[PDB]
Amino acid sequence: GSHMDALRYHIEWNRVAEPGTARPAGRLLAVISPDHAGAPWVTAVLDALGPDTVRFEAKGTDRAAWAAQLAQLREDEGEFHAVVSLLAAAEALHTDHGSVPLGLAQTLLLAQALGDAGLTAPLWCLTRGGVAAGRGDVLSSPVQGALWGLGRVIGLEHPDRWGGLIDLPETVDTRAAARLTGLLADAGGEDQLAIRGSGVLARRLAHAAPAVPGSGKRPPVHGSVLVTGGTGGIGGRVARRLAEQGAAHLVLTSRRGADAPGAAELRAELEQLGVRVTIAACDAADREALAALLAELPEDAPLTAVFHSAGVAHDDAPVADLTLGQLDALMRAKLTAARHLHELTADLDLDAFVLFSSTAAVWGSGGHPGYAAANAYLDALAEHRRSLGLTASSVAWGTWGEVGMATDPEVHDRLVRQGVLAMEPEHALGALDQMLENDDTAAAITLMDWEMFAPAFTANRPSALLSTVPEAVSALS
Amino acid sequence: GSHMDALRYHIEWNRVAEPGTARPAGRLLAVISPDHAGAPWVTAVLDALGPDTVRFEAKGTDRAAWAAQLAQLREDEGEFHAVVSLLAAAEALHTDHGSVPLGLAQTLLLAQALGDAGLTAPLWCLTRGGVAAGRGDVLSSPVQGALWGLGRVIGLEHPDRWGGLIDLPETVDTRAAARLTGLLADAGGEDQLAIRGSGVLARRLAHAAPAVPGSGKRPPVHGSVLVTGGTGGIGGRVARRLAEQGAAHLVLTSRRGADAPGAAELRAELEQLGVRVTIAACDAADREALAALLAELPEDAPLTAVFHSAGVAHDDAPVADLTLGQLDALMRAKLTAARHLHELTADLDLDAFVLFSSTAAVWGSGGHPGYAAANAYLDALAEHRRSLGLTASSVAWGTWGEVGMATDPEVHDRLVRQGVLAMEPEHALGALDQMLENDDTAAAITLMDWEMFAPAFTANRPSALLSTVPEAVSALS
Ligand SMILES: NC(=O)c1ccc[n+]([C@@H]2O[C@H](COP(=O)([O-])OP(=O)(O)OC[C@H]3O[C@@H](n4cnc5c(N)ncnc54)[C@H](OP(=O)(O)O)[C@@H]3O)[C@@H](O)[C@H]2O)c1
Numbered sequence: 015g016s017h018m019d020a021l022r023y024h025i026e027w028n029r030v031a032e033p034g035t036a037r038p039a040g041r042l043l044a045v046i047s048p049d050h051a052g053a054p055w056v057t058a059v060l061d062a063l064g065p066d067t068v069r070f071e072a073k074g075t076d077r078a079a080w081a082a083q084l085a086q087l088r089e090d091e092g093e094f095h096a097v098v099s100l101l102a103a104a105e106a107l108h109t110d111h112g113s114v115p116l117g118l119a120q121t122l123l124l125a126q127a128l129g130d131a132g133l134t135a136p137l138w139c140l141t142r143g144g145v146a147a148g149r150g151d152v153l154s155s156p157v158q159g160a161l162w163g164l165g166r167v168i169g170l171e172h173p174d175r176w177g178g179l180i181d182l183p184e185t186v187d188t189r190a191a192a193r194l195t196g197l198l199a200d201a202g203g204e205d206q207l208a209i210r211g212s213g214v215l216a217r218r219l220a221h222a223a224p225a226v227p228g229s230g231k232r233p234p235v236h237g238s239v240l241v242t243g244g245t246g247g248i249g250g251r252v253a254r255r256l257a258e259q260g261a262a263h264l265v266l267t268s269r270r271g272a273d274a275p276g277a278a279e280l281r282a283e284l285e286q287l288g289v290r291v292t293i294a295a296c297d298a299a300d301r302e303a304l305a306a307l308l309a310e311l312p313e314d315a316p317l318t319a320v321f322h323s324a325g326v327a328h329d330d331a332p333v334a335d336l337t338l339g340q341l342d343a344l345m346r347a348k349l350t351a352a353r354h355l356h357e358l359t360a361d362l363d364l365d366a367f368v369l370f371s372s373t374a375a376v377w378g379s380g381g382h383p384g385y386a387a388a389n390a391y392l393d394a395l396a397e398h399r400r401s402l403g404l405t406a407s408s409v410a411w412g413t414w415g416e417v418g419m420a421t422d423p424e425v426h427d428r429l430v431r432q433g434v435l436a437m438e439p440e441h442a443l444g445a446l447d448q449m450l451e452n453d454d455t456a457a458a459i460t461l462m463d464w465e466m467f468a469p470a471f472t473a474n475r476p477s478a479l480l481s482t483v484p485e486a487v488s489a490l491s
Numbered sequence: 492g493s494h495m496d497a498l499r500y501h502i503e504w505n506r507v508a509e510p511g512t513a514r515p516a517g518r519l520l521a522v523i524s525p526d527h528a529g530a531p532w533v534t535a536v537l538d539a540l541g542p543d544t545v546r547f548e549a550k551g552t553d554r555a556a557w558a559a560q561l562a563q564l565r566e567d568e569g570e571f572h573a574v575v576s577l578l579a580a581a582e583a584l585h586t587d588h589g590s591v592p593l594g595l596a597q598t599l600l601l602a603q604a605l606g607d608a609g610l611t612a613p614l615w616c617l618t619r620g621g622v623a624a625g626r627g628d629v630l631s632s633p634v635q636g637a638l639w640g641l642g643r644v645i646g647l648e649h650p651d652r653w654g655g656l657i658d659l660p661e662t663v664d665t666r667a668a669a670r671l672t673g674l675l676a677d678a679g680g681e682d683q684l685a686i687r688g689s690g691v692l693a694r695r696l697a698h699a700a701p702a703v704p705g706s707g708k709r710p711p712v713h714g715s716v717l718v719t720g721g722t723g724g725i726g727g728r729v730a731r732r733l734a735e736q737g738a739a740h741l742v743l744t745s746r747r748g749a750d751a752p753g754a755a756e757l758r759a760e761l762e763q764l765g766v767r768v769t770i771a772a773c774d775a776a777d778r779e780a781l782a783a784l785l786a787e788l789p790e791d792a793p794l795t796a797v798f799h800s801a802g803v804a805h806d807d808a809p810v811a812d813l814t815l816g817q818l819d820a821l822m823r824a825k826l827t828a829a830r831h832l833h834e835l836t837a838d839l840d841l842d843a844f845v846l847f848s849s850t851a852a853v854w855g856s857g858g859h860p861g862y863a864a865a866n867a868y869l870d871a872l873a874e875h876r877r878s879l880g881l882t883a884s885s886v887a888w889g890t891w892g893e894v895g896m897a898t899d900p901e902v903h904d905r906l907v908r909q910g911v912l913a914m915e916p917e918h919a920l921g922a923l924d925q926m927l928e929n930d931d932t933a934a935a936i937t938l939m940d941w942e943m944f945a946p947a948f949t950a951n952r953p954s955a956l957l958s959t960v961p962e963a964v965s966a967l968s
Pocket residue numbers: 242243244245246247248249267268269270271274296297298299322323324325326327346347370371372373410411412413414417418419420
């Protein structure tokens with residue numbers, strides 16, 4: 015019980031002190047995506063930054079061209095107090111990389127090209143409705159939410175030229191503008207911020223409250239349950255659990271399907287438990303294949319839940335190196351697949367819609383920008399779905415033992431050294447069931463050694479995020 | 492800043508499980524105050540407990556007579572599943588002890604007489620509007636609120652025959668009744684509960700929100716400020732602070748007034764800071780003297796704030812021993828004085844109405860039932876005043892160093908050994924200002940060693956209260 019409780023953490027937002035009322039002394043550089051500069055919040059921000067602010071229009075996605083343009087600007091215009099990116103407004107998918115929002119691609123390349131050009135002014139990435147901050151906040155853009163995943167990794171990899179992330183309110187009035195320009199002047203060590211009418215909120219990680227025994231509001235598991243990546247490590251273990259809890263029919267998918275290693279043994283396992291088993295080969299980013307799968311479900315066993323476990327973590331790279339192709343391949347099973355899943359099942363009144371995220375999206379991991387972005391999309395999509403009145407849960411896993419991605423010893427060793435320890439599957443799954451019985455929207459489930467993790471995480475840069483974890487605070491004293 | 496944040500804690504109420512649907516197997520004993528059994532909620536509870544429930548009418552306040560009656564009842568009727576007290580409905584002040592609500596007197600004597608008689612069934616004390624539980628809840632009876640202070644100490648001193656405290660809703664309908672009889676059957680380890688229309692809530696302690704400059708909009712300190720107990724330890728330090736922050740005129744009161752030890756030095760201190768000082772000898776329970784003090788304030792310096800620091804903690808005693816006389820002397824400067832202060836200033840539109848409480852009222856302290864009751868009144872009165880649209884704050888201090896009650900070394904040693912550490916006055920006052928800047932209604936301000944405190948506090952009995960303090964959870968794991 016308390017073993018599972020100890021695994022569960024929650025992102026929350028605390029009010030922080032009002033900033034000062036002077037705009038920065040030095041000049042700002044504002045980066046705009048020229049075909050996506052029309053949104054009201056972009057206009058309001060440009061107006062708040064004032065006419066002295068230099069504007070750079072980021073056209074297309076050409077790293078070398080931008081580097082040369084930025085170098086010229088630095089030469090001509092001198093040094094900047096900060097760089098303020100409005101590239102998040104470009105939500106349309108990149109025409110050559112169908113799983114990458116244009117704004118996300120352009121933000122990556124901007125971070126690369128600023129380094130290339132030696133423009134060292136701290137980079138601030140602005141979004142509008144990419145987080146749910148404050149009671150009753152509406153996360154209106156899960157695409158912009160992905161950009162926070164990337165941003166946190168930029169802060170780990172380039173801490174000395176990263177400013178942070180600020181989410182703007184729906185209405186950027188004079189209060190909100192003064193709060194924005196104040197933070198850009200000095201942010202008081204905060205770097206993950208939401209501006210809202212009631213004040214300025216900052217992102218915090220906290221222990222979740224211990225499960226209240228006997229208090230579950232989870233519907234019984236029944237009918238058909240789709241587990242994407244269901245032939246993989248965590249997915250198989252999740253499929254078994256669901257079978258024990260009363261699913262009538264488990265639909266497992268993956269690109270390899272019945273050819274996936276271990277698939278024949280997993281099917282026989284599930285059939286011993288008295289469950290119908292369908293194992294289908296198909297890319298979760300393929301909308302038509304998903305539709306066809308849902309259309310052929312038994313009339314006796316309609317879809318009641320989705321567990322999205324499809325994902326890859328390999329072929330990622332440092333921010334300074336990551337290509338748009340590698341980014342696309344990392345986003346595919348996460349952004350594109352989850353969006354299909356959401357759209358195809360929105361009208362089905364599901365009991366559960368569970369997205370498997372990662373701690374790489376909670377606090378960030380160096381070397382894993384694309385994976386962090388892709389999983390940050392899932393967290394944001396769950397908040398978005400709740401605002402529409404749909405069920406959703408995003409579970410950001412730490413490291414599993416025994417099965418799945420993280421059982422390579424070299425990977426394992428790296429993680430244990432950072433203090434992200436391998437969970438026993440029974441404990442991880444038990445903590446998941448607690449989350450689902452509480453009907454939480456988003457949680458991290460992870461076994462930590464804070465005495466290892468906190469000093470490693472904050473070596474280069476303090477983290478206000480962790481100020482609300484007493485073990486982290488205590489490690490750093 | 493964050494050091495002062497770390498001193499501040501906040502009582503909150505979280506939803507817990509719906510209880511079961513079976514009435515207790517064994518028979519209940521219901522204790523009623525015969526002249527005060529008319530209230531609607533008392534009738535509704537008696538009806539919910541059903542006709543099999545044995546009734547005991549607690550007449551007067553005679554410990555020995557009740558002990559003999561209870562012994563007879565046990566003889567005749569057997570042992571009981573639990574004892575359900577409805578004595579809180581007696582809000583009228585005791586005829587012989589003008590600071591003691593009759594119900595509070597009778598609850599003490601009941602807890603004493605049950606022990607005397609060897610009735611071991613867990614004692615549950617019911618109240619109606621004695622806490623503010625849930626958003627927009629109205630604490631309508633601060634007198635009944637005092638009973639929760641006493642109750643928590645009964646739980647520390649007699650953990651094996653204490654059930655707990657349950658606050659009923661305004662309307663005890665069938666849902667509320669089934670919730671009550673379900674909790675009496677099995678409370679799932681909870682012992683501080685509120686039944687409301689939306690469900691069952693339980694009492695929780697959390698770290699308070701970090702300071703945000705000017706959020707509660709505290710007005711500037713100005714005009715005349717009354718500090719009762721102003722010649723005493725904390726009071727004098729509070730007077731000094733207010734003088735530094737621009738009070739025009741400090742009115743310090745105590746029973747000894749200008750004869751109080753150190754009073755001539757404190758006057759000179761405050762006057763060096765440019766403040767006018769009035770020191771009056773004045774029992775804060777004397778309504779007429781307080782009225783005369785308020786009537787003589789200059790029109791150029793009207794009353795703007797009250798800081799209620801009057802109080803005694805000595806000559807308390809264990810629950811088993813405490814007399815009504817001792818109880819009266821502890822309640823006097825708290826209940827009676829605060830009530831006068833509330834009534835005489837209700838129409839003055841104060842900027843601040845600040846009551847000095849104790850952690851003895853937050854979580855309880857063995858050997859200090861009378862003090863805990865008296866201070867729990869202050870917490871409840873602050874919530875009550877907020878429901879009326881009046882300003883109020885209750886500050887439940889831990890232990891001060893340097894000045895005041897707790898500076899005796901053997902007392903100090905006992906506290907340090909329980910993990911309640913002595914605060915530096917500047918840090919305690921800094922935390923108070925944070926609380927007043929946020930305009931919080933109730934907070935505890937205390938320096939804790941949770942690794943010492945949690946195991947000592949829960950040695951004999953678990954505490955759900957502390958499950959929401961991660962340092963407590965970690966100490967116990
Ligand atoms: N293991 C951990 O410690 C951990 C920590 C954080 C988060 N996670 C998340 O948990 C989930 C499960 O991870 P795991 O450890 O079970 O990894 P795994 O054993 O590699 O399983 C991943 C599954 O996703 C499938 N997949 C990959 N891309 C797909 C696509 N486009 N369409 C459909 N299926 C696809 C894979 O099969 P094919 O290759 O045959 O398609 C595989 O069955 C992942 O989303 C991962 O991001 C895991």
